[PDB]
Design a binder for this molecule. Structure first.
Ligand SMILES: O=C(O)c1ccccc1O
Ligand SMILES: [Cl-]
Ligand SMILES: [Cl-]
Ligand code: NA
Ligand code: NA
Lengths: 148, 148
């Protein structure tokens, strides 16, 4: 068994501590808007797409979740009038998710607070050099994990 | 509003993607042992404490969660005979979470596999320089988040 060295262990535990604490903190900061981070991430992905809409299978890939889990989540967001589903007449490759105007306005309301939170708890705490170096180091990890 | 620059946004999204994918993968690798990552984190904290026990209030602080959330998790682990709650005779009254013999054996069985997983999905994918850098860059973010 190759136990972690002191240097490896420290890096691993710092990563894990930041991951856990940051996820909690960002969720906490969205709570007053009645949104989960999962909700917010869908709003962002849709708003950055042409026509504010995406094929469900492409949205599933972008949010790294199963067809069935995304479907449940979209039903929840539909019930909150944030998104709607649309049929495709021309093929059988599935439904589109589309942002509603209420979804758009919700995004526009929350985004400034979310960006301020991301900055105060993370981005503004990193030197530009460390940000770049972190990104170059972590990109291949994302790639490995996406493949896995 | 100071919107994220392109460089900041790319880095931020890579951090999010890695945090999410890595948590999912490590949870998946623990599944054959019947353990969640929350379970495992408590096993680790207890096994690294003197006497393989910790005061519940210290354990809440160490895992950065509320008294009520920890309590629900400990109940689950107690039902699984991994930990016991005990008002241990002590000079300072207080409730302890105590690793059971089954907890300790479970830890000894699972730890080698978990370390192999942490290596294959993360640690063995990082150059020594990026490991040092991760640690130096992220420590102040962990500090900030703990202070919240
Ligand atoms: O999953 C881990 O390896 C770990 C390490 C330190 C503290 C809590 C944890 O879950
Ligand atoms: Cl558009
Ligand atoms: Cl000990
Ligand atoms: Na758009
Ligand atoms: Na110990």
């Amino acid at each position: 068994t190759r136990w972690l060295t002191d240097t490896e262990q420290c890096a691993w535990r710092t990563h894990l501590e930041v991951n856990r604490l940051l996820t909690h903190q960002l969720e906490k900061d969205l709570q007053p808007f009645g949104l989960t981070m999962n909700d917010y991430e869908i709003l962002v992905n849709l708003s950055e797409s042409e026509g504010d809409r995406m094929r469900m299978s492409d949205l599933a890939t972008a949010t790294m979740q199963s067809k069935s889990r995304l479907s449940h989540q979209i039903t929840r967001m539909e019930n909150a009038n944030l998104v709607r589903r649309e049929n495709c007449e021309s093929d059988r490759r599935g439904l589109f998710a589309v942002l509603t105007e209420h979804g758009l306005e919700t995004m526009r309301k929350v985004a400034p607070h979310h960006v301020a939170s991301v900055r105060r708890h993370f981005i503004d705490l990193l030197a530009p050099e460390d940000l770049t170096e972190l990104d170059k180091a972590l990109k291949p990890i994302a790639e490995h994990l996406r493949g896995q």
